[PDB]
Amino acid sequence: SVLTKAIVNADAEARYLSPGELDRIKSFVASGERRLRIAQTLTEARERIVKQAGDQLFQKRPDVVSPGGNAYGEKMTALCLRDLDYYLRLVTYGIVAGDVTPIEEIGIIGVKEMYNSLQTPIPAVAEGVRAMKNVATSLLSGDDAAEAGFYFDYLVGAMQ
Amino acid sequence: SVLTKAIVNADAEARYLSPGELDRIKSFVASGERRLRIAQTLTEARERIVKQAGDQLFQKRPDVVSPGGNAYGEKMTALCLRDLDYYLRLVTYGIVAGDVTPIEEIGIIGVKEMYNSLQTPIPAVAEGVRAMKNVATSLLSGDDAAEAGFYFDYLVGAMQ
Amino acid sequence: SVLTKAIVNADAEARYLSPGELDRIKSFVASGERRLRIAQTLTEARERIVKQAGDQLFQKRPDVVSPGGNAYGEKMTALCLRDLDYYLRLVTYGIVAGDVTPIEEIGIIGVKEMYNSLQTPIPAVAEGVRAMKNVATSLLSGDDAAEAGFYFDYLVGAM
Amino acid sequence: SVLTKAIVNADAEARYLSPGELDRIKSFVASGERRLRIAQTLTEARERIVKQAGDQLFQKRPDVVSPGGNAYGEKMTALCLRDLDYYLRLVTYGIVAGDVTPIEEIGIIGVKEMYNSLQTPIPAVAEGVRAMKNVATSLLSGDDAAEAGFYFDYLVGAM
Amino acid sequence: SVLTKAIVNADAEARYLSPGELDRIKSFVASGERRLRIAQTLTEARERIVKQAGDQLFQKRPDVVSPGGNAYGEKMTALCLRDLDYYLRLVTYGIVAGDVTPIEEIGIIGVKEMYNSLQTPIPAVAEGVRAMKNVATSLLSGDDAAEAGFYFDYLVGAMQ
Amino acid sequence: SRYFKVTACIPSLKRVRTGRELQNTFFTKLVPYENWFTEQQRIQKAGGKVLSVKLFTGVQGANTGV
Amino acid sequence: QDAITAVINNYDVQGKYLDGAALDKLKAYFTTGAVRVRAAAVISSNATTIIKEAAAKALIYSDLTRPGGNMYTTRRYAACIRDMDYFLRYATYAMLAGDPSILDERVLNGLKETYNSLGVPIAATVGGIQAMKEVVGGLVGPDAAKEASIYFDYLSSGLS
Amino acid sequence: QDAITAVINNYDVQGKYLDGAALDKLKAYFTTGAVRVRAAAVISSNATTIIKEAAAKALIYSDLTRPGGNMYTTRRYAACIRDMDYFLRYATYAMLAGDPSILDERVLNGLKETYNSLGVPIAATVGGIQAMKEVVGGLVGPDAAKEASIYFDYLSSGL
Amino acid sequence: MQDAITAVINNYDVQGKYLDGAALDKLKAYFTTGAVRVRAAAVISSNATTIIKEAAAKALIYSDLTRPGGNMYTTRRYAACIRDMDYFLRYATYAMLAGDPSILDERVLNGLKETYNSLGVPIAATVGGIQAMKEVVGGLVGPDAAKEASIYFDYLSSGLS
Amino acid sequence: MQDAITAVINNYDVQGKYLDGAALDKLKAYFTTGAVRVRAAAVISSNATTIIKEAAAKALIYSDLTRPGGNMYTTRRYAACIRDMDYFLRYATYAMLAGDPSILDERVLNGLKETYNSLGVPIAATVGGIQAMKEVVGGLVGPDAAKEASIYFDYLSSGL
Amino acid sequence: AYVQVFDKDIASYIRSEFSALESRLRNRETSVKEFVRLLGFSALYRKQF
């Protein structure tokens, strides 16, 4: 989170936290309560978000759920949905943290390599995340949606 | 300034400013008008603040204005007061900037070396700044005083 | 010591001792006996040197022994004198060694930091050492005094 | 020279000259006049020293002045003697300097490489220098000889 | 041997062996049988090669076998011949390996230092190897001689 | 001078490397005493864990020869 | 790392989405935050004095400072006060973070082994840390003191 | 090192010149060589698939991949497949070489200790290596498989 | 760097000549001066901080430079200027012991003008400070030493200007 | 490292005692020995190459070690062994000048046994070589110097 | 390493001044960083730069 980042910069400089740095920490702690609510909303709607996004993705990409495609078959389709669920969980973690770092360590480093071994198409995964964003945005209020959008966008950018 | 600090962090990361960082900039620009008033108050009371602080310092430290002491004599006493005035000007600059950096470049880097050549005692200088803080606090309203205090405290910390 | 310094330089270069280096060692061993006597003299006069220097320092700097000043009070004044004694002991060690290295490790590294935490003024400490030098010089013969002076000067330079 | 060496060490440390370093300088300046005389003696006897040393070397090493050997032939033998003369000149420079540095720059750096290209045997060159030392020692007084010996030994060590 | 060389280059690049590299390995394994015969020839003629080369060397350099010289005396002369024998054995190893590496590890690294302690002249040693080459070349057929020459030349280059 | 023998492991969290990193990952090294302080901090800042520290050379609690 | 991130990490290993109970812990932290920021600023300004007072309480006027003691000689004295500073800085960082982990990652790791090789006395060091805690407690004030104390105690327990 | 060099080294320690018996061992290797080259090309082309199949057999659909498992998170997953690739590449190198030494020098040395610090499970890794062996065996074909298997087994035993 | 003794040696070495009496006399001259120089150097080292203080008081401080808009205004700049002053003093002391100006050229003098011009540091003021240090140094060292000390200070001044 | 003079100083410093006559006597003893030591050191430096040669001839060469399958077989190993011999000689010379065995412990002796055991270098043979060097050195230095020289050589041998 | 730290030209002249340093690296008791430090802390560096 923001606080960790501030501490880390201070430690590198080997100095106590600057007033400005301290102020940013104060702002973040005030924002946190609002952030928690946004995260809570998505958590409650999680099951539906995943389901709706999955359907959209499969409509957008018939191929993935086709005999050739990776997603095809019950086992495989479940795994694809599980992946979507994982990414949503990561996004919620991000919102509460106020930073993408939590998201980034768990999901975005080595993602290309992992999916290439699996042979899953990376662009399709990105589309699924985009789909989840749209569903999530609708349930969220506009200002809340914008905050959530940033984290969703980062994921889409990372998996490109 | 706050904005300069944010830009510098972004440039190090080689990224565009984050939304969160942008929000902090927005908050700062709103705060600025209040900050300007706080600075204005101290500027008007500057002459009296310096005078009062000087007297307090000399009471606290008889030695500095003693024949042995550096401050002793008219010329020397004037220079000591001039220094106090300089630090006050720096503090005002800091309040408007919202950061200690302006203060820091002009006054706190190489200060030890300069004063050691002069042979002025650093702790006495710190006391003078503390004295100025107390005078300034009284004239300022409580919330204004807290803001001003942070900058004053930084100076005291720097000269240690 | 002189010898330690020479060996260390040689080891860095990974070479046997240079003729010039060897010559300096030879000179040092000849000087040593004289050096021992100089050190002995100061040790015997140690108590008086410290006392006289202390008085001079306090006259030079009234402030240090004043309510504001660090030295003020019996406990504090004793500690200030103890410090002067420490530095004198270090100087004697230096004279026998023929190098400031022994002095330097015990007394001159981190000295600034230590005194800054204590809040003792460094220039006053230097004055005390200068004062000790003057007392020591008087008791020493002129040539002996010059040798002792170098070590005293180093200390003053270090702080 | 001694002084150059001391200054260089100080500059690396970014400090003023240490008392010990200063003392060595003092000793050197006193020694210098004696050193000048030692150097003068060797210069006057230079021609004979080289000649005698050459003969000794050739007796010690028949091979070098043999059809296979590098030294063989008038031209080559002259060059070998010229080299001995060069080293003697360097040693005199060293004595006045009080340090091998002057010697080292002119003669000891890249010496291996130069001789390897020439194919001259390095050990034989060393023997020649040893021979020169013995001749030089005889002409010098004992204390003078010891001083000169150090520089001669350095050369032998270097090659 | 050659194959080791190829593997090492691949490992540095962190890649599987290139087709071209693999082809060179194939060629080497085919060549090996011919190489073994060349080595066998020299082994059989080894005793005479050493003897002839020794004589040539001593004629070329009277000094080495002279009271001053290192080689002088029966014990010493035997050791000089033993050294020549060692180098010949190394050359045979090289031919079968197809690389100088086997030769190099046993004989060419630290050779200068070893001989300098012994005080043996390095150029004379080189002449001995050259002498051995000439004898060996005569017994070998022309194409075989060229192959053997390369290894002999390397030794001469190394001790130089 | 006093010397420290230090064994420390640093994981490569930022990026995965194809070339062998074993020497970088797990290293035993000799550190000058003066340098060690800074080095220890650097390992901490990296997020590496210092498995073992020992004083290879010099004497503990030495006033001189340090 | 941070209290917020610690909660996230615990959930991530479980694979659980963030839940209300988790949210409550995060909420608790957010309220405490403001107090912590104020405490940190106090400590930074008074850091030099805090160290001075603590040294006076435990380290100085002791066998340690006397010849044959661990903190005898200027070099050792300076080292000990440098260590004291680090403990203070890291404790301040921990207090802001709300997490003990940074102390483990930064201060606690490799300290015991270093100290044992050096022959630095652990119990005396612990004593110094406890002294700093007491001084800090005064300056920060009671609400802040409780929070500050836990991190100081954590450091002490680690060293012991 | 290599089979050819291994023979050479054995002779060198004996000091023996190369003999027919030694030559026969080398000849044996040369016949096997052609087969090995073909096997290596097969492995290189199918390397990505080999890893995929082996992972499917052991690593994926397992607790490791599930949260709280060693291979959980993309970073860890990627690391594990990178390690698998290493083992494959080195085994291929060893098969061409005809010697297990390279495995010891690069892969096997320090791996156990690294894994223990990391908390990577050795037994699971060994399982993965065995799985790769089985897949490799199929592709290479029977004659090649025997040769390939020994190096895979060597890695497994070391780990 | 080079010193007096080495300078003589080097001149002879390029000629290839063995050391001669005329050369020896130059060396002898240096040896007599040497003892004085060593004493002077010790004096300077002990009083270095004060020398700088006095020289600054004479020229640099209580001036436009120290006043806002001046080159030495702000603590950082003030500290830099006194650091430079210390450099000049240390190197001059080295030169005095050596008996040769070369070290000044090799370390201090080379590239200083260009550095100062980019920085916008005023050369004439710096020269003024060097001259002030010389005057203070002259007093402490005493007359015989002062003449020797002065030449190196003047050399620095000429180089900068 | 440490020397004799510094060793006395350090012992006094831990006691906090001023230098006393008994201490002075030890220092005086060293000063008399000093002149002899300097002469010995110069002798050793000039004859270093020969000393190593003679010692090798006495123990290392014409032995199983040099024969194939021996530790010092191959040029690389031979060169390593003579390099080690040189190290021992140089350090012993340093120790003799210093009058203290500590430098041997700090540079040569520490970790050597373990290194040798991993390498498979034979310690007893190395010790034999050191003893041989001692004997050669003894001759060159002359009797008074020899006693002093011997102790350092013996110290190395005992350590190994 | 010699070529990085000294320049190419000076690195050519090096025969074995650092032989002891090399051995510690060969032994794997020092790191490459440490080896580079010590080349930097060397008379040769100082003399040449």
Ligand SMILES: *[C@H](C)[C@H]1/C(=C/c2[nH]c(/C=C3N=C(/C=C4\NC(=O)C(CC)=C4C)C(C)=C\3CCC(=O)O)c(CCC(=O)O)c2C)NC(=O)[C@@H]1C
């Ligand atoms: C759905 C959008 C797409 C899709 C998915 C898909 N995934 C798998 C198998 C796996 N996916 C993962 C992913 C993760 N594991 C993690 O730890 C993380 C980070 C938190 C991620 C994102 C993994 C490791 C597996 C392996 C199985 C397991 O983990 O238990 C499959 C099955 C293919 C297979 O061979 O296993 C599928 C189908 N496929 C598509 O094409 C969709 C676009």
Ligand SMILES: *[C@H](C)[C@H]1/C(=C/c2[nH]c(/C=C3N=C(/C=C4\NC(=O)C(CC)=C4C)C(C)=C\3CCC(=O)O)c(CCC(=O)O)c2C)NC(=O)[C@@H]1C
């Ligand atoms: C002959 C061409 C020249 C010559 C030879 C010579 N050698 C020695 C002594 C030794 N030679 C070796 C060399 C090797 N050891 C190895 O491992 C290898 C590579 C496989 C070689 C080449 C060794 C070890 C010795 C030491 C003695 C021993 O056998 O253990 C001598 C004797 C000199 C001495 O001091 O021992 C000689 C004469 N010298 C010449 O003059 C010829 C030009």
Ligand SMILES: *[C@H](C)[C@H]1/C(=C/c2[nH]c(/C=C3N=C(/C=C4\NC(=O)C(CC)=C4C)C(C)=C\3CCC(=O)O)c(CCC(=O)O)c2C)NC(=O)[C@@H]1C
């Ligand atoms: C996969 C079959 C199993 C697995 C692997 C795994 N490894 C790591 C991390 C590392 N593995 C190594 C090992 C090597 N480095 C080398 O150079 C070599 C030989 C050439 C090997 C084999 C290293 C050094 C690391 C650290 C990361 C780095 O790149 O430096 C992980 C991740 C653990 C971590 O925290 O890094 C994993 C998961 N573990 C399993 O669960 C599989 C059964």
Ligand SMILES: *[C@H](C)[C@H]1/C(=C/c2[nH]c(/C=C3N=C(/C=C4\NC(=O)C(CC)=C4C)C(C)=C\3CCC(=O)O)c(CCC(=O)O)c2C)NC(=O)[C@@H]1C
């Ligand atoms: C006298 C010239 C000045 C002076 C002295 C003063 N010192 C202290 C306290 C201490 N001084 C030391 C000094 C040393 N300890 C060492 O190990 C060495 C190196 C050999 C030295 C020189 C120490 C450690 C202390 C701390 C107390 C203790 O020893 O236990 C004080 C008291 C300050 C306090 O608050 O403790 C004083 C007054 N004071 C001046 O102003 C004089 C100019």
Ligand SMILES: *[C@H](C)[C@H]1/C(=C/c2[nH]c(/C=C3N=C(/C=C4\NC(=O)C(CC)=C4C)C(C)=C\3CCC(=O)O)c(CCC(=O)O)c2C)NC(=O)[C@@H]1C
């Ligand atoms: C002071 C309260 C006590 C004390 C301290 C002491 N420490 C040292 C030397 C070292 N201490 C450390 C510790 C750290 N290094 C780190 O990276 C961290 C985390 C930020 C710590 C806490 C280290 C590495 C050293 C060695 C080198 C250095 O100076 O850093 C000494 C000196 C001991 C010596 O023999 O030199 C001392 C005295 N000892 C006391 O007496 C107090 C009780």
Ligand SMILES: *[C@H](C)[C@H]1/C(=C/c2[nH]c(/C=C3N=C(/C=C4\NC(=O)C(CC)=C4C)C(C)=C\3CCC(=O)O)c(CCC(=O)O)c2C)NC(=O)[C@@H]1C
């Ligand atoms: C007063 C609290 C103490 C005191 C003051 C004192 N100062 C001087 C002289 C100077 N102080 C400064 C300081 C500054 N110049 C800058 O650029 C800045 C930042 C903007 C500062 C703070 C300078 C440069 C001078 C030199 C004077 C000049 O302009 O030339 C004196 C006079 C001493 C003298 O010899 O000049 C005094 C007395 N003295 C004390 O002891 C008090 C504790």
Ligand SMILES: *[C@H](C)[C@H]1/C(=C/c2[nH]c(/C=C3N=C(/C=C4\NC(=O)C(CC)=C4C)C(C)=C\3CCC(=O)O)c(CCC(=O)O)c2C)NC(=O)[C@@H]1C
């Ligand atoms: C003091 C008499 C005058 C003065 C000086 C001044 N200098 C700087 C900055 C630098 N000074 C140097 C100079 C040197 N570096 C060298 O290597 C040498 C040769 C030995 C010298 C003399 C350098 C390189 C710097 C820049 C980097 C640094 O600060 O360390 C400043 C600061 C300039 C700025 O704008 O920051 C000043 C003020 N200026 C005066 O007013 C005096 C006339």
Ligand SMILES: *[C@H](C)[C@H]1/C(=C/c2[nH]c(/C=C3N=C(/C=C4\NC(=O)C(CC)=C4C)C(C)=C\3CCC(=O)O)c(CCC(=O)O)c2C)NC(=O)[C@@H]1C
């Ligand atoms: C000769 C008397 C015996 C001998 C020597 C030998 N040593 C090694 C290898 C090493 N030697 C050292 C030792 C040192 N390195 C140093 O820096 C110092 C202090 C100045 C010493 C004494 C080291 C560290 C090594 C290993 C790394 C390296 O190669 O330098 C070998 C090589 C062993 C091998 O298998 O490569 C040998 C042969 N062995 C003998 O046969 C003699 C009895």
